[PDB]
Amino acid sequence: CPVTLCSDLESHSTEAVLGDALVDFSLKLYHAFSAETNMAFSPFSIASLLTQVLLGAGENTKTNLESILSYPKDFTCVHQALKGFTTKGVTSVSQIFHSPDLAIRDTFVNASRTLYSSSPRVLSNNSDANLELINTWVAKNTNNKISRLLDSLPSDTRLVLLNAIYLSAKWKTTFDPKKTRMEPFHFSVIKVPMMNSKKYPVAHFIDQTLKAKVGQLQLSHNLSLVILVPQNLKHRLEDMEQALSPSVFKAIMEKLEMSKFQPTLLTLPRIKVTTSQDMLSIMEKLEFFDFSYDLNLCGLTEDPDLQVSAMQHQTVLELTETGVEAAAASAISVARTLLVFEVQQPFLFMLWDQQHKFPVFMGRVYDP
C-alpha cells in the first residue's frame, strides 16, 4: 500500500468505458435482485458507494470490487470519470463519518475532498446523535424523500461511507391530471392509479429477441423513462428478463436512441415505489468467495480492525403528471429489508441517462 494517479482524462473514451461498466453492473444487480416482486433501486448509487470503497481499497479487495463492477484492470481515471456523471437532473454526493478513534489517511482525505468536495466527519460518543447526523445528511441530499435511511447505529460503529442521489425532471409533454383515473385491476380485486393520454409522444418498437415492446418517454435534462413490456400475454416477464443480456440491452438502447417519438395512446401506471434492501447481500451473489472476509482498506486507514458486513440501500421513485422524482441512498452500515409496492401489469423500467448512457434507477413491476 502507498493513492492519487489520474492526471489526464480523455473524456469520450473513459466515459464510454464507465457507462458500459455501469450498464453491465446494473444488469448483474437487476438479475441477482430478481432471484418474485416489485422494486426499484439505483445501480448508480450502489456503484458510487462501492467505487468510494474502491478508492481506499488495497490490492486483493480492488480486484474483487473491480470484477463486481465490471471496471477494467487499469481504470485509474474511474473516480474522475464518475464525478462528471452528475447532471442537472441528477445529484450525487458522498460522505464519510468515523469515530475519533479511527484515523483516516491524509491521502484518503485529500482524494475525498477532490472527488466529493467533502471531508470525513467525526462521530460523537452518542449513538442517537450519530444516527440523526447521518439520517439528516441523507434527508438533506434526497430532498427529504429518504428521511430515515438507518434504523440504528451500533455503539461499535467506527466507519460509515454513504452516497445519496436525487433525480428530478419534468416530462417534455405533461399528462393532464383530470385524465388520471383509478382503474380496476384484476389481481381480491383492486383499483390502481393510471395516467392517460391518447396522443402521448412515445418512441417505441417491438424487439423480436426479448419479445417485448420497448418504449421511452422523454424528460428534461437528457433523462428518459424506458419501459420494456412483454409484447403480449404469451410471454412472461421472467423470460424477457433472462433474454436481457448486456449485448441485447445495448442494441435496444442504440435503436431506441434513433427512434422517433410518435403519438401513442398511453396508460402509464402512476408508479410510486419504495424499496429498502441489504444490497451487500445481493452484491455478494455476484462473487463466489466473499470479499468482506479479507476486506483491505489500507488506502483509507492504517487501522486493520475495520469490517464491512452490510450495505443499506433505499430507493423512492415517483411518477406524476408533471415529471419524475427518484431518490436513493446507500451506506456501509446495518441494513433492513422492506419492499413497498403497488401491484401492476408486468414491466421493467429505467430512468436512463441518455447523455452518459447508463441506468440511474431501475425497477420491475410484477403481477403475481
Ligand X SMILES: *[C@@H]1O[C@H](CO)[C@@H](O)[C@H](O)[C@H]1NC(C)=O
C-alpha–C-alpha distance, residues 106 and 278, integer Å: 30
- Compute φ and ψ for 183, nearest 5 degrees: -115, 145
With CB atoms as reference, the residue minimizing the distance to ligand X is 110
Query: For residues 176 and 302, which CB has a smaller minimum distance to ligand X in the complex?
Result: 302
Which CB, 105 or 357, lies closer to ligand X? Answer: 105
CA dist 100 and 360 (Å) reads 34
If the CB atoms of residues 114 and 262 are measured against ligand X, the closer one turns out to be 114
Asked whether 143 and 168 are in contact (CB, 8 A), the reply is: yes
Cβ 113 to ligand X shortest distance, Å: 8
Contact (Cβ atoms closer than 8 angstroms) between residue 217 and residue 225: yes
| Distance from C-alpha of 191 to C-alpha of 179, rounded to nearest angstrom | 15
CA distances from 263 to 179, 197, 201, 269 (A): 16, 9, 5, 18
Minimum distance from residue 104 beta carbon to ligand X (Å): 12
Q: Are 32 and 24 a contacting pair, CB within 8 Å?
A: no
Measured from the CB atom, is 4 or 124 closer to ligand X? Answer: 4
Cβ at position 114, least distance to ligand X in Å: 9
Closest CA to 231 of 205, 207, 243, 213: 213
How near is the Cβ of 300 to ligand X at its closest, in Å? 14
Least CB distance to ligand X at residue 42 (A): 31
Shortest distance, position 55 Cβ to ligand X, whole Å: 14
CB of 93 to ligand X, least distance (A): 21
Closer to ligand X at the Cβ: 80 or 355? Answer: 80
Q: Which is nearer to ligand X, 105 or 270 (CB)?
A: 105
CB proximity list for 3: less than 8 A, separation 6 or greater: 55, 56, 107, 108, 111, 299
Q: How far is the CB of 110 from ligand X (least distance, A)?
A: 4
Sequence-separated (6 or more) residues with CB below 8 Å from residue 304: none
Is 22 in contact with 44 (CB distance < 8 Å)? yes
Separation between Cα atoms, residue 33 and residue 361, nearest integer Å: 14
Task: Using alpha carbons, list the distances in angstroms from residue 326 to 28, 171, 212, 338.
Answer: 21, 14, 25, 17
Q: Could you say which DSSP state residue 321 is in?
A: S
- In the complex with ligand X, which residue's Cβ is closer, 117 or 209? 117
Residues lying near ligand X in the complex (CB under 6 A) are found at 106-107, 110
Residue 109 or 334: which CB sits closer to ligand X? Answer: 109
Provide the minimum distance between the beta carbon of 346 and ligand X in the complex, in angstroms, as a whole number: 52
Question: Would you say 225 or 298 has its CB closer to ligand X?
Answer: 298
Which of 237, 229, 239 shows the shortest CA–CA distance to 267? 229
